[PDB]
């Protein structure tokens, strides 16, 4: 069975390098081409360029050629793509694929690179109360890295949840989390957010209060 | 390069429905050894593109039948016929007959429902957020439909664009709709020299934003 197995996900400090590896099984190492493909968060993909181990051959999207560098250790079957000088148009999910000639491809399952100088740091937990159904929520707000785990009641309120998807600004991660309830639950009842971050092995709760 | 033009850009179907989707390169894909490299994939949240369709016509193995590709020249086409729950996703066509190779910017395939306005929420910062010395002023736009929406945030009646962050949800399993958040971050200083904060919802179900706001 062919296999693709690439490197885990990486956190690379601002104007370094980074080599990222794609390791084949199944087949004779040196007869498939390698190709790299680029997709940043909620964007398509962008082909970066085409290696062949068996003879060292490459070649590389225009876009990427100050970018990207091709390698490989035929003794580990293994293919490298080295990314320069990092900025935040890098930071992307990597995926390797590979191919005989005229033959189908099969995909690795992506490297996510992601630019930041920020060390592990975890969340500030924010409680969102207002000024039939009610909506509350939670601010979680200054973590490095992804990702973070948020329930609320300990999981015993799964309905009405929203947790939207963490951005990146000035280094740090930020994410929000609503929660919907009848009113006749709020403030009469506790609601609870709970916020774990497995990188700082920290997990805080907040109790949402009427301001 | 070869530009490859996918559309829809979107398309709302019910499960059972027939689907199809176009591609269309600028320039013959047609490679010299007579082949034409065309193929699909598609590509669901968190995971990696999968193959469904290669040398335009071609199931890949393991692939329903229910999925079909066809084309010739620059003129290409995938039919879903009965569309079921995990055929939702993004789909892409690849040429790999002239580099560089080139993708279609996708088009995604999501469930129909009924529209339904954003329910709007407006979140003044939390008096410990104010302790540490920063504003986060949070707006939610909660299940609606469909997935296209704008938010305006105003300061005492002014625009500001400056500090913004937007996220949006998958489409909801549940219920089939869409939610956004909104979080306008000030410094604390700038914050207590304001009164009156907005967040407007443009969204097609109305010809008037929704507003909400709080005051200081
Ligand atoms: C992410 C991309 C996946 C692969 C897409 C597609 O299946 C590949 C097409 C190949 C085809 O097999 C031969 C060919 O020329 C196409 C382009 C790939 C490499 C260039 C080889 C040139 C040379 O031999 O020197």
């Known amino acids: 069975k062919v296999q693709l197995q690439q490197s885990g996900a990486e956190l690379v400090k601002p104007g370094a390098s980074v080599k990222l590896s794609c390791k084949a099984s199944?087949?004779?190492?040196?007869?498939?081409?390698i190709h790299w493909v680029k997709q940043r968060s909620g964007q398509g993909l962008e082909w970066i360029g085409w290696?062949?181990?068996?003879?060292?051959?490459?070649n590389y999207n225009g876009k990427f050629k100050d970018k990207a560098t091709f390698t490989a250790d035929k003794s580990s079957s293994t293919v490298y793509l080295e990314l320069s000088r990092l900025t935040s148009e890098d930071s992307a999910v990597y995926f390797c694929?590979?191919?005989?000639?005229?033959?189908?491809?099969?995909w690795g399952q992506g490297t996510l690179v992601t630019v930041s100088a920020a060390k592990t740091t975890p969340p500030s937990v924010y409680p969102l109360a207002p000024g039939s159904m009610v909506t509350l929520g939670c601010l979680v707000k200054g973590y490095f890295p992804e990702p973070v785990t948020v329930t609320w009641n300990s999981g015993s309120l799964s309905s009405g949840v929203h947790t939207f998807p963490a951005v990146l600004q000035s280094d740090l991660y930020t994410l929000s989390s609503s929660v919907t309830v009848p009113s006749s639950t709020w403030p009469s009842e506790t609601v609870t957010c709970n916020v774990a971050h497995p990188a700082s092995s920290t997990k805080v709760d907040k109790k949402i209060v009427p301001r | 390069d070869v530009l490859m033009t996918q559309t829809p850009l979107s398309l709302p179907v019910s499960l059972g429905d027939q689907a199809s989707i176009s591609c269309r390169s600028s320039?013959?894909?047609?490679?010299?050894?007579?082949?034409?490299?065309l193929e699909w994939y598609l590509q669901k949240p968190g995971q990696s593109p999968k193959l469904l369709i290669y040398?335009?016509?071609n199931r890949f193995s393991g692939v329903p039948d229910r999925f079909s590709g066809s084309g010739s020249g620059t003129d290409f086409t995938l039919k879903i016929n009965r569309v079921e729950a995990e055929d939702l996703g993004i789909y892409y066509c690849?040429?790999?007959?002239?580099?560089?190779?080139?993708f279609g910017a996708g088009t995604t395939l999501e469930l129909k429902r009924a529209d339904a306005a954003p329910t709007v929420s407006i979140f003044p910062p939390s008096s410990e957020q104010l302790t540490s010395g920063g504003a986060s002023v949070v707006c939610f736009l909660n299940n609606f439909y469909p997935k296209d929406i704008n938010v305006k945030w105003k300061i005492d009646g002014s625009e500001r664009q400056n500090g913004v962050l937007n996220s949006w949800t998958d489409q909801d399993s549940k219920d089939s709709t869409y939610s956004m958040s909104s979080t306008l971050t000030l410094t604390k200083d700038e914050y207590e020299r304001h009164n009156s904060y907005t967040c407007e919802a443009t969204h097609k179900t109305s010809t008037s934003p929704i507003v909400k706001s709080f005051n200081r």
């Open positions: 320039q013959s894909i047609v490679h010299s050894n007579g082949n034409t490299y």
């Open positions: 290696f062949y181990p068996g003879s060292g051959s490459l």
């Open positions: 690849l040429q790999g007959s002239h580099v560089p190779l080139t």
């Open positions: 199944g087949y004779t190492f040196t007869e498939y081409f």
């Open positions: 040398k335009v016509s």
């Open positions: 694929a590979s191919h005989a000639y005229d033959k189908e491809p099969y």
